[PDB]
RNA sequence: CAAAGUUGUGUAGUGCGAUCGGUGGAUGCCUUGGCACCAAGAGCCGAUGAAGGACGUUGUGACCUGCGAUAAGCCCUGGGG
């Protein structure tokens, strides 16, 4: 899974929790990469892409491009 | 055999020719680059912060191109497969 437009079915607070969880996962991945672990390197970019998606949804809600749930 | 006389000279090197190579990158044939134009556009950008940059950004060392900590990319829409 890589997240998609179903993030628009979530609420603001749980989307922000999603942001925090994604940031923590990226932190762990970066530490693994530094320490020599993390064979799965593509996730290291996909997590940042997911953060971008969640910020996209939040900003469209904030700017009223899409009606806020 | 002696006497008198004649002629000859490449083991150092060199010249010329032929031949076989080396160096060199001319020539010929090209080209992801230029040059001069034609036709149609567009003729402004900027405090909603420009022109141009610095630094950063990739699974990984650099540089170029793109991008800006949402960082060779995020979303919507249409096309295409
Ligand atoms: Mg003209």
TrEMBL record:
Lineage per the UniProt record: Bacteria, Bacillati, Actinomycetota, Actinomycetes, Propionibacteriales
UniProt-recorded name of the protein: Large ribosomal subunit protein uL29
Alphabetized UniProt keyword annotations: Ribonucleoprotein, Ribosomal protein
InterPro entries documented for this protein: Ribosomal_protein_uL29, Ribosomal_uL29, Ribosomal_uL29_CS, Ribosomal_uL29_sf
Organism the protein comes from: Cutibacterium acnes
A GO CC term attached to the entry: cytosolic large ribosomal subunit
GO MF annotations in UniProt: structural constituent of ribosome
UniProt cross-references to HAMAP family, sorted A to Z: Ribosomal_uL29
GO biological process: translation
CDD domains in alphabetical order: Ribosomal_L29_HIP
PROSITE patterns associated with the record: RIBOSOMAL_L29
Family, similarity comment: Belongs to the universal ribosomal protein uL29 family.
């Amino acid at each position: 899974k890589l997240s998609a437009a179903e993030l628009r079915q979530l609420s603001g607070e749980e989307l922000r929790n999603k942001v925090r969880e994604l940031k923590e996962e990226l932190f762990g991945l970066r530490f693994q990469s530094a320490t020599g672990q993390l064979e799965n390197t593509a996730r290291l970019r996909e997590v940042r892409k997911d953060i971008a998606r969640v910020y996209t949804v939040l900003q469209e809600r904030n700017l009223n491009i899409v009606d806020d749930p």
